[PDB]
From Swiss-Prot:
Database matches in PANTHER family: 8-OXO-DGTP DIPHOSPHATASE, NUDIX HYDROLASE FAMILY PROTEIN
Keyword RNA-binding: no
Record-stated family: Belongs to the Nudix hydrolase family.
UniProt cross-references to CDD domains, sorted A to Z: NUDIX_MutT_NudA_like
Protein name, as recorded: 8-oxo-dGTP diphosphatase
Length: 129
């Protein structure tokens, strides 16, 4: 009976290096690629919302955010959303990981093979990148 959106917007920028939570510790698996949440709500548009949710987390400036696409996972009583504002040129350090680690990830044109099926609706598009 509620709804919420997430102004994450992965941030690939070395070639396709996103600041995604990439198993900081050496993991035996490789599907630990979630998405730097942030919760869009500030202002009243995915711009001031994600952009302001961008600085409020780390504290950089650039990043050249871009929509690219977004999903909407529906739950029994949880209407969630997840704006994927993909950026590609942050200053020195990135900025987006919510309560997650968020770390540069040398993936290479995402494939969804390293990302969990949970965010299937958007990971399907990264696959194309
Ligand atoms: N993909 C997802 N699946 C399920 N729940 C999600 C989700 N993305 C976000 N949520 C949940 O929905 C809540 C959104 O409410 P908000 O309080 O507006 C977030 P927030 O506290 O403003 O931002 P924050 O993400 O920086 O903590 C989050 O606390 C999160 O737990
Ligand atoms: N910005 Co929050 N209140 N679920 N940590
Ligand atoms: Mg936030």
């Amino acid at each position: 009976m509620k709804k919420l959106q997430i102004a994450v917007g992965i941030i690939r920028n070395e070639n396709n290096e996103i600041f995604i939570t990439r198993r900081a510790a050496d993991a035996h698996m490789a599907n630990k690629l979630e998405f730097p949440g942030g919760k869009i709500e500030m202002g009243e548009t995915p711009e001031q919302a994600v952009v302001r949710e961008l600085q409020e987390e780390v504290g950089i400036t650039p990043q050249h955010f871009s929509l690219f696409e977004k999903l909407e996972y529906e739950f029994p009583d949880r209407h969630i959303t997840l704006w994927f504002w993909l950026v590609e040129r942050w200053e020195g350090e990135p900025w987006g990981k919510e309560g997650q680690p968020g770390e540069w990830m040398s993936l290479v044109g995402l494939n969804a093979d390293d990302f969990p099926p949970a965010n299937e609706p958007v990971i399907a598009k990264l696959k194309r990148l």
